[PDB]
Amino acid sequence: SGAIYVGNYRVVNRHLATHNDWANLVWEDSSRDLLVSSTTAQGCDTIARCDCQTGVYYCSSRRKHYPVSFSKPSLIFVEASEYYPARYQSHLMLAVGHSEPGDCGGILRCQHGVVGIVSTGGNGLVGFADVRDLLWLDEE
Ligand SMILES: CNC(=O)c1cn(C)c2ccccc12
Ligand SMILES: [Zn+2]
Incomplete structure (x- = not known):
């Protein structure tokens, strides 16, 4: 497990994305195994x-x-x-x-x-x- 928290984006492995990630989808690419979702608090x-x-x-x-x-x-x-x-x-x-x-x-x-x-x-x-x-x- 693990994510990147860059501003109000959450970057995860597409194969580990949660329902919340899919319900807040910004962008996903199966070919890259990446999915990005929206956040409410900014990241470090x-x-x-x-x-x-x-x-x-x-x-x-x-x-x-x-x-x-x-x-x-x-x-x-x-x-x-x-x-x-x-x-x-x-x-x-x-x-x-x-x-x-x-x-x-x-x-x-x-x-x-x-x-x-x-x-x-x-x-x-x-x-x-x-x-x-x-x-x-x-x-x-
Ligand atoms: C899509 N993810 C994976 O299945 C794997 C990811 N890592 C790093 C592996 C290492 C050995 C074998 C399988 C994987
Ligand atoms: Zn560098």
Whole structure:
């Protein structure tokens, strides 16, 4: 689990979105595993605007933050899971690291702020859904 709270937006894994999230929908993309919903109280997170490939992510299943190198947000094939069929996920970044399904929502952060959230993984690899192209998250 986990979310990004950027102003009056809540950014979660589409596959973990609640009824309240869907009842307050701002934007969703199955191809990106992202859903954004509206909030009433403002959040304590800032979004990175950058092309950093190094950062730190939170891994719930180790209670540990790990420094990682990660790929550029790309269109990449992801093996079938409980939540999606074998498909290409868009705006995705891969790192070498530990990840389990419930680690989804863990933040990846760089010097510029929040890069993305844990989404995909397997075989000692962790995948993060990028949010840095979502400029509209920063306004209105
Ligand atoms: C759609 N979410 C998932 O199913 C997964 C997310 N992470 C990080 C995994 C790691 C190993 C295996 C499956 C997943
Ligand atoms: Zn950065």
